[PDB]
């Protein structure tokens, strides 16, 4: 049904686990930050994006910030 991710889904460098959904006519990846017990029914990729100033209930990845 969906992948229930833990805190150790993507442990590569600084690329955190993100639940990304690709937008239709928008060049933005609609990503939710993966936490312990997230029912990820979307593409669980490992991206770095910005966890420095952003990182709430939603995050938009501009493509060139993910290695998956």
Swiss-Prot record:
It is found in: Secreted; Spore wall. Changing residue 32 to I: Does not significantly affect self-assembly and rodlet formation. GO terms for biological process: cell wall organization. GO terms for molecular function: structural constituent of cell wall. GO terms for cellular component: extracellular region; fungal-type cell wall. The keyword Secreted applies. Disulfide bonds join 10-46, 19-40, 20-31, 47-66. The keyword Magnesium does not apply. Self-assembles to form functional amyloid fibrils called rodlets. Self-assembly into fibrillar rodlets occurs spontaneously at hydrophobic:hydrophilic interfaces and the rodlets further associate laterally to form amphipathic monolayers. Aerial growth, conidiation, and dispersal of filamentous fungi in the environment rely upon a capability of their secreting small amphipathic proteins called hydrophobins (HPBs) with low sequence identity. Class I can self-assemble into an outermost layer of rodlet bundles on aerial cell surfaces, conferring cellular hydrophobicity that supports fungal growth, development and dispersal; whereas class II form highly ordered films at water-air interfaces through intermolecular interactions but contribute nothing to the rodlet structure. the Cys3-Cys4 loop (residies Cys-20 to Cys-31) does not have an integral role in the formation or structure of the rodlets and that the major determinant of the unique properties of these proteins is the amphipathic core structure. Belongs to the fungal hydrophobin family. This is Class I hydrophobin eas. The gene is eas.
């Amino acid at each position: 049904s969906a992948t229930t991710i833990g805190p150790n889904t993507c442990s590569i460098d600084d690329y955190k686990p993100y639940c990304c959904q690709s937008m239709s006519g928008s060049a933005s990846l609609g990503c939710v930050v993966g936490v312990i017990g997230s029912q990820c029914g979307a593409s669980v990729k490992c991206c770095k994006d910005d966890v420095t100033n952003t990182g709430n209930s939603f995050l938009i990845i501009n493509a060139a910030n993910c290695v998956a």
